[PDB]
Design a protein around this ligand. Sequence first.
Ligand code: DCP
Ligand code: MG
Ligand code: MG
Ligand code: MG
Length: 540
Amino acid sequence: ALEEAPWPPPEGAFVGFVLSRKEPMWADLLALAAARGGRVHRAPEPYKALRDLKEARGLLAKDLSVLALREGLGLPPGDDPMLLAYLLDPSNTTPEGVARRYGGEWTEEAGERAALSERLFANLWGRLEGEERLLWLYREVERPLSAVLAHMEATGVRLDVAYLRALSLEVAEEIARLEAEVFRLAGHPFNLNSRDQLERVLFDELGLPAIGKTEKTGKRSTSAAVLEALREAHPIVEKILQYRELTKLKSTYIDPLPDLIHPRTGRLHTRFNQTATATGRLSSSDPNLQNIPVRTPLGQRIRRAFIAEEGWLLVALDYSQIELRVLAHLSGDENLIRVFQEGRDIHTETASWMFGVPREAVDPLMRRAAKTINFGVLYGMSAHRLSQELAIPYEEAQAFIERYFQSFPKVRAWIEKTLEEGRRRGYVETLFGRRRYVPDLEARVKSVREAAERMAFNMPVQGTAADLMKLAMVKLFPRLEEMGARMLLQVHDELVLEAPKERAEAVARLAKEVMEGVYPLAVPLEVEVGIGEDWLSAKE
DNA sequence: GACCACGGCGCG
DNA sequence: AAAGCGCGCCGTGGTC
Ligand SMILES: Nc1ccn([C@H]2C[C@H](O)[C@@H](COP(=O)(O)OP(=O)(O)OP(=O)(O)O)O2)c(=O)n1
Ligand SMILES: [Mg+2]
Ligand SMILES: [Mg+2]
Ligand SMILES: [Mg+2]
């Protein structure tokens, strides 16, 4: 179809490329092509050809940019049809689907990918015309953010490998102690990793009371919540919970991470997926660095393995109570606004009630426990679940939920208004106009409809917080480059940077200010910042 | 060796 | 498990 023309392509051409594997830091670049003006140009040798491009423009542009950075080439990502489609409808998350939906087919040939990028860009650009607010998000947030993400991905983070290896050996011995006790208590060995085998042991052999059922298959659940309720019924329960905690951490973090160090950089490299969530948040994968443990003693030990380069420090910055502040702005609730104008902390207040201690006596881990409670209740947690999680009577859980919303009267009104508009329009939106379609708001099945409602009224809050963080990253990145500091990770409302020791204090101050001032709301945004040699010490 | 669905669980 | 929401990865079980 397209006239095949000699490499290289003219400037502004759209690229297509094929990787040996999905991870750009680990992939071999198998093929590269570009398309423009009814022509397709195929590179005879992809790696060398990379040097001819001045911009990665096309589907998955960021990925190619990350591969280019890895090879020491400064090839920034530009237009990407994925970002246009994702803004039109965040269910647009794969090139396979976007292609089918907007005008072609995602194949495994670079030339075809190049032509496809060009055609999809034309069509999607046409769909965005008139959508002033989505276009603003594209130009002011998503497009420039992809460049920032590319640098983050290519930079990676330093990990204390020997430390994790040593930790693995210690945790293995403790796991053996736990499994042996579980087998002694069961009266026989079995695969303790199999929730099917454990189910039979707990509920059929030991005759414990089943408490809950699983979603898809209706099996008797062995979840931590069920085990928690059974803690008193049998000694084997506590041992299983401890085994579960250790094996989770070992199988997910301690063992896999050390093996993922890149041979060229000597660092660990995640992917920051820009078109992966329904709300506008980023996700992180291969490996996921947005869920590194932090709650338990062993989890904290693991977080300590994330460290600064010699002569550098980590700077960790985290928005205070962020979705509550966002909620205050979206809902306009006078009481909630006043909470933040007065410098109050709702997590600490709930924690002090939960644990029956003065606010001054609330420690960091008590405060963290209050977050599930505060956001749980806000986004529709049942009194039954609440009562179970707090080990208080059903009636007390009910009253806590009532006082919560009674304290902030306009919140319920905002929720109702949000749902009404979502029903009529078919979508809900963030402060900046990012959309999520929620068709099930009119489902005739109550459980399905109500589930859709909770998704719907949560999206403007979580999504607005996401837009704010993305905007802050776009503003902050060029200031960091100027100071010779690096942006390493984003964890939803937190950034982790790496700075030369002599500039770390200046970097911390500047980053705090950029993040707090990103987009003034009806309440102040506050950012907590710490500096340290490891990720744990840097969050104070 | 691969894929999936599921339950389960780590973080935000 | 339960009327929190958003993710990605683990091992098991079942295929292919
Ligand atoms: N169990 C949780 C924890 C967090 N979040 C969302 C809402 C939070 O505001 C946001 C950021 O998570 P944080 O842990 O940083 O919580 P906060 O910003 O609210 O409190 P903090 O002051 O400790 O940073 O993610 C959530 O929906 N459910
Ligand atoms: Mg926060
Ligand atoms: Mg946070
Ligand atoms: Mg799942």
